Structure 1
Amino acid sequence: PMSKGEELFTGVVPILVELDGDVNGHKFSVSGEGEGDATYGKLTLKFICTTGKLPVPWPTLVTTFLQCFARYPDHMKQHDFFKSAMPEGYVQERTIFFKDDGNYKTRAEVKFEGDTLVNRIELKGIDFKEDGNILGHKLEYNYNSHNVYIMADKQKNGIKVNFKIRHNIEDGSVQLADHYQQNTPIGDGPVLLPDNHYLSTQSALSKDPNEKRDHMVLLEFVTAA
């Protein structure tokens, strides 16, 4: 292959997602489970809020809830930092600025625990407007397609990422979430540091009609470029 860790993703890999969140004081925890298939770049997940009802819309948390499952084509596996960081994993820090509303601050650890790919997150949301689009729940239960731009970080043998999410507001228009992401490896061994390249995402949000807990099922498709 191109990296040792890439061989960890040659099969469908089960996923565990854990988030502790806090938004304008509202505390919540989410658990998610599912599997990823990096050779297609497909991910299917079902998250449940385990503390009651999510204080913010589920689409706002999609990008916080696994980029080691991106399908890197053959002529591009030399650019796949995420798998090269494995098994030991990487920290994934992000500051999301929602246009004209508050911010999320998120810290995650993405690593193999056993045979499962685990993304363990802490999220802090501050300065949200009581009736803005987030705390007003004015977003639509859907998700656009995005292009997330990836650059190597030579000083930290990691990657600096920047992209912008489009949250379809119920009134038709778009509420921007501007993501500032930093990925830093947990282990000593070398990593693949990529030439500037894009990741293409597609995401489907739906529900599990025999689960009556606040939940989100996510069908995500990620590919390199």
Structure 2
Amino acid sequence: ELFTGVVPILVELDGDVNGHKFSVSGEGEGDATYGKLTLKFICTTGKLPVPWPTLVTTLVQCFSRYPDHMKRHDFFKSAMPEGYVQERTIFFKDDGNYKTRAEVKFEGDTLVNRIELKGIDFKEDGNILGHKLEYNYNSHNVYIMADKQKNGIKANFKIRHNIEDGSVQLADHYQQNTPIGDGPVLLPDNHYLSTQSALSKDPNEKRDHMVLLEFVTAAGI
């Protein structure tokens, strides 16, 4: 399996929110055998317009650990190596909305994720815009459902971003995944993904960035 060893991963995300241009290149490693991911992200254009944590779900579920018995419901890796397209509608509570389409497929030996993030409605008084979210993250449950007609998968899970004043900024997700090829895929039984993410820094990096440690496991069935 492509994921028996450790896999290199690169991330190209191009964003635009309320007209502000920005680009983030990510790179790292991910061991699927343990639902553990590792990545460094540079705001390649300069100064990230929107907070780093608010972009975490956009910056590869094909790296989660799917126990041996659930191995038949791992659609993400079913998709491989032709990849899968992931589209998302994110709703941050009482502020705007992110819209993202991504292409994550094998580009050689290095798993490549390519995103285009669009965003609108962001208030110049809101937590998102006025950088009020704390640099950290919590844990969540990402629920998946086999969209049978579309041969892909469906996801809807919610994220809570903490604001400097404890306040819990809510991020509703509307996630759709569809294979990129015709190599028959794996519709799965309803199950969820328990993620753990820790955003952090780098003493060495003088460039605007984010450092993220992810530990994900398929649990459910």
- When the two structures are superposed, what TM-score results if normalisation uses the length of structure 1? 0.97
> 2: CA distance between counterparts of 1:173 and 1:146?
17
Q: Match for residue 78 of structure 2? A: 84
> 1:138, CA displacement in angstroms?
0.3
Matches of 2:12 and 2:87, distance apart in 1: 15
Quote the offset at 1:88 in angstroms. 0.4
CA distance in 1, matches of 2:167, 2:201: 23
Q: How far apart are 1:151 and its partner, in Å?
A: 0.4
| 1:172 aligned to which of 162, 166, 170 | 166
CA distance in 2, matches of 1:201, 1:212: 29
Moved over 2 A (4+): none
The CA distance in 1 between the partners of 2:170 and 2:112, in whole Å, is: 28
- Secondary structure, counterpart of 1:82 in structure 2: helix
Unaligned runs of 5+ in 2: none
| Aligned counterparts of 1:184 and 1:122: Cα–Cα separation in 2 | 16
Kindly, what percent of the aligned residue pairs are identical?
A: 98
Mapped to 1, the partners of 2:208 and 2:37 lie a distance apart of 20
RMSD between superposed Cα atoms in Å:
0.5
Shift of 1:173: 1.7
Give the superposition deviation at 1:75. 1.0
Distance in 2 separating the partners of 1:213 and 1:189: 41
CA deviation vs aligned residue, 1:161-219 (integer Å, no higher than 9, x gap): 00001101110121000010000000101111110001000000101111111000100
Shift of 1:43: 0.3
Partner deviation per Cα, 1:40-68 (whole Å, 9 max, x = no partner):
01001000001010000000111000100
Alpha-carbon separation, structure 1, partners of 2:101 and 2:59: 11
Aligned length in residues: 219
| 1:121-174: CA deviation from partner (whole Å, max 9, x where unpaired) | 000010100020010100000000000110001011110000001101110121
Following the alignment from structure 1 to structure 2, what is the Cα–Cα distance between the partners of residues 85 and 117?
A: 12
Counterparts of 2:148 and 2:137 in 1: how far apart (Å)?
Answer: 33
1:76 counterpart SS class: helix
Q: Distance in 1 between matches of 2:157 and 2:94?
A: 17
> In structure 1, how many angstroms separate the alpha carbons of the residues matched to 2:185 and 2:211?
32
SS where residue 9 of structure 1 aligns?
A: coil
Cα separation, 1, equivalents of 2:204 and 2:63:
28
Mapped to 2, the partners of 1:10 and 1:157 lie a distance apart of 26
TM-score by length of 2: 0.98
In structure 2, C-alpha distance between the alignment counterparts of 1:174 and 1:82, rounded to whole Å: 30
Q: CA separation in 2, counterparts of 1:69 and 1:40?
A: 8
Hey, what does 2:209 align to over in structure 1? Answer: 215
- Matches of 2:35 and 2:5 in 1, distance apart? 11
| 3-state secondary structure, aligned to 2:156 | strand
Q: Could you tell me how far 1:95 is from its partner in structure 2?
A: 0.3
Residue 9 of structure 2 aligns to a residue in which SS?
strand
Counterpart for residue 46 of structure 2: 52
* Structure 1 residues 8-67: Cα deviation after superposition (integer angstroms, max 9, x where no partner): 111100000000000000000000000110000100100000101000000011100010
